[PDB]
């Protein structure tokens, strides 16, 4: 008998594609061989970072009484967190804008 | 016919619906998220490849990915990413 197919993402409990990640690792000329757990680990890490940024962006959207996440919300999420800002320090986000800040010396009186 | 283009749009959308069931996302935001996912994938994969090369190994295993995550992600991001990766690999091996 032949067992029914089950995607490795569901086997690992992930939403991101373990198979696509494994294929990209194999095709990217990163190493001669790729271990079985490497794509699962990488998919899990990518999913974690995506979930973190998306939840922060959603909170930012809620604070602005908005229903959809736009690039401004992604920018606000990233730049209001030291760790994410350090991870994405040399990154430009299109239509993200900048954080509102005015140097204190410029204010009146 | 025309070539099919692959993207992380559907998986990003599933994660968004997991964390924010009622929140939507614009097309430009989804493009930014695709760019972010590709960039982090490239960073981690390159660091893992260099780790394997330095140690004269032909295989990128979960150890290389874990060390790349530790090197790249700062602070508590690294700890939580390592926890998630270890949990995922343990669940995958269990099944």
């Amino acid at each position, epitope marked *: 008998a032949r067992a029914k197919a089950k995607t490795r993402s569901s086997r690992a409990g992930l939403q991101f594609p373990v198979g696509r990640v494994h294929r990209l690792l194999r095709k990217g000329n990163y190493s001669e061989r790729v271990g079985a757990g490497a794509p699962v680990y990488l998919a899990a890490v990518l999913e974690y970072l995506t979930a973190e940024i998306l939840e922060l962006a959603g909170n930012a959207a809620r604070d602005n009484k908005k229903t959809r996440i736009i690039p401004r919300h992604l920018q606000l999420a990233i730049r209001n967190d030291e760790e994410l800002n350090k991870l994405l320090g040399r990154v430009t986000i299109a239509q993200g804008g900048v954080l509102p800040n005015i140097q204190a010396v410029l204010l009146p009186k | 016919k025309r070539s099919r283009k692959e993207s992380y749009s559907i998986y990003v959308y599933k994660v968004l619906k997991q964390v924010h069931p009622d929140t939507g996302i614009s097309s430009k935001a989804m493009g930014i998220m695709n760019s972010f996912v590709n960039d982090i994938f490239e960073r981690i994969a390159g660091e893992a490849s260099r780790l394997a090369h330095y140690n004269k190994r032909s295989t990128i295993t979960s150890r290389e990915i874990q060390t790349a995550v530790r090197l790249l992600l700062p*602070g*508590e991001l690294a700890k939580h990413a390592v*926890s998630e990766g270890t949990k995922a690999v343990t669940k995958y091996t269990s099944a």
Partner: single-chain antibody
Amino acid sequence: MDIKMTQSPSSMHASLGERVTITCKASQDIRSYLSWYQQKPWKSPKTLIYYATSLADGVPSRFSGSGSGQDFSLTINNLESDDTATYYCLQHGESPYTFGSGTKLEIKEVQLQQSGPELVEPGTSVKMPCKASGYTFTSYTIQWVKQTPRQGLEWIGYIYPYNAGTKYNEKFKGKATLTSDKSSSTVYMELSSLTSEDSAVYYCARKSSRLRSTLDYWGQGTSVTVS
């Protein structure tokens, strides 16, 4: 509106070696953002479980956390004389963080310096520091918690030294004000117009900006008494 947190076993008794199960229920979904703490009498609480399953640093595997959604539980397998303490569940899935009612159990380097006890007359104001060391100061928020025998633990607010952003509990808005000084690596908690009910013990606790992180290291606490 605020998430009321219910711990069914208000108190319990046990002997050595046997198992214990403490349940904590949420009035709304919090998606596994639950933390468990152990507080010895006259000591700062210590973290046991965070994210409802993860074991905190330095905690033995005797403690086990489980649950998701609105039902959560804490389990201790091999009890010891060291396990005599009060246990609280903390949810931080929504802006006003709510502690559990508490559960009394009896068996038959990061550092946050805090000032000593202070006596103040009603109507004045007090400023209690919280000097932190042993980690990157800007990368972690400093949470503030008020503990009373009547109302138990209550979350006041936090300040993020990275950008000086603050979030206050609606109950303590106006009453409490938070400020930070990056040069001295110190965070200050200001209480205005002291009342009789404001007499309590105030803890400052470190929390990372990460969503699943919890209050991991606590200050010894500053006991404030109002005549």
